[PDB]
Design a protein around this ligand. Structure first.
Ligand SMILES: Nc1ncnc2c1ncn2[C@@H]1O[C@H](CSCC[C@H](N)C(=O)O)[C@@H](O)[C@H]1O
Length: 327
DNA sequence: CCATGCGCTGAC
DNA sequence: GTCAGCGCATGG
């Protein structure tokens, strides 16, 4: 994450739905906003959340009575994506874990926050010939909100990972917010190689497979793109190796393959997957964030999470729009 | 639970 | 064509 001088969200309360690791919490708090409610049903996720924020999030949002949720100014929600991801089945709203947006909508209908800040995978935008997105848009509008949506790639915001996510910012209509803008992209000055842990701390992650196929030579100059240096097996998900002079591929929650959830990287002559701390870093999490003790659970958590830096820029721009109240 | 080989969709 | 994806299924 980065340092935020002007705390644009000072005095604003927000809720952290589908909390996960609390990325939205890191982002909005860094802007001066106060978290007054969190909800996350996964046992282990609740563990890390509590480990870092000192409170356990409420469980199953589908059973939470909308009316019990504390009044708030900004509702934050990076809802489930398995039902929309390009990597899954794409069953959408007809999937058990694909109807959560309606719970969010049910909550908004009752508490009318000033802002609804949501996030989901890039494929969400084009899913089901845009109807899924349209549904969200129309739902937001009927609730009397503007709807601002855009896919932003983490690589354009200072983090070496090609995580393309759609962000939807909605402002309550009576606020007449006409100046909201998604942050402008800037040059990448950080690469995978710059976030790695010392070799001593990561030897156990080295996999020596006899089927490594060097598809491309390592590169001498750093580049803001994912450079595949080779595959293993059939080169499917979890079986591709990339240059550390480039950027990280998208971290995943239930990803498979020998380099599950992080992908392989050619490091100082060797081939290995990322360590949970490196995943923390690739997601913009500060080194002070305590990762969950179970590696498998930490890999999953980070793969489901958000890039803090991107949220901090957006969160700042939401605050800028809210503060412009001239006579 | 943890590990892994998918095996296809979508974006160009 | 080329190649990457907050995934799935199945083994133990
Ligand atoms: N019905 C439900 N009630 C509460 N939490 C739920 C839920 N269904 C899914 N979730 C949780 O919502 C999350 C979606 S992924 C969101 C990650 C979060 N943005 C972060 O910063 O890490 C997962 O942690 C999942 O366990």
């Amino acid at each position: 994450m980065i340092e935020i001088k002007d705390k644009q969200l000072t005095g604003l309360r927000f809720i952290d739905l589908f909390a996960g690791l609390g990325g939205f919490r890191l982002a909005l708090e860094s802007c001066g906003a106060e978290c007054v409610y969190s909800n996350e049903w996964d046992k282990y996720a609740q563990e890390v959340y509590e480990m870092n924020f000192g409170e356990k999030p409420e469980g199953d949002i589908t059973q939470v009575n909308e009316k019990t949720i504390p009044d708030h100014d900004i509702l934050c929600a990076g809802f489930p994506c398995q039902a929309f991801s390009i990597s899954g089945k794409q069953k959408g709203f007809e999937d058990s874990r694909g109807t959560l947006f309606f719970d969010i909508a049910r909550i908004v209908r009752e508490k009318k926050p000033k802002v609804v800040f949501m996030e989901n995978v890039k494929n969400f935008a084009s899913h089901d010939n845009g109807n899924t997105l349209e549904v969200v848009k129309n739902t937001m509008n009927e609730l009397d909100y503007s709807f601002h949506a855009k896919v932003l790639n983490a690589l354009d915001y200072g983090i070496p990972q090609k995580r393309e996510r759609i962000y939807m910012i909605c402002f309550r209509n009576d606020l007449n917010i006409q100046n909201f803008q998604f942050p402008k992209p800037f040059e990448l000055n950080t690469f995978v190689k710059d976030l790695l842990l010392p070799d001593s701390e990561v030897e156990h992650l080295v996999i020596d497979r006899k089927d490594l196929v060097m598809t491309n030579q390592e590169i001498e100059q750093t580049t803001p793109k994912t450079v595949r240096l080779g595959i293993v097996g059939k080169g499917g998900q979890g079986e591709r190796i990339y240059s550390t002079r480039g950027i990280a591929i998208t971290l995943s929650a239930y990803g498979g393959g020998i380099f599950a959830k992080t992908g392989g990287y050619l490091v100082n002559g060797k081939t290995r997957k990322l360590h949970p701390r490196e995943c923390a870093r690739v997601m913009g999490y500060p080194d002070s964030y305590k990762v969950h003790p179970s590696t498998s659970q930490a890999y999953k958590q980070f793969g489901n999470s958000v890039v803090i830096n991107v949220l901090q820029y957006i969160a700042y721009n939401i605050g800028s729009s809210l503060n412009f109240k001239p006579y």
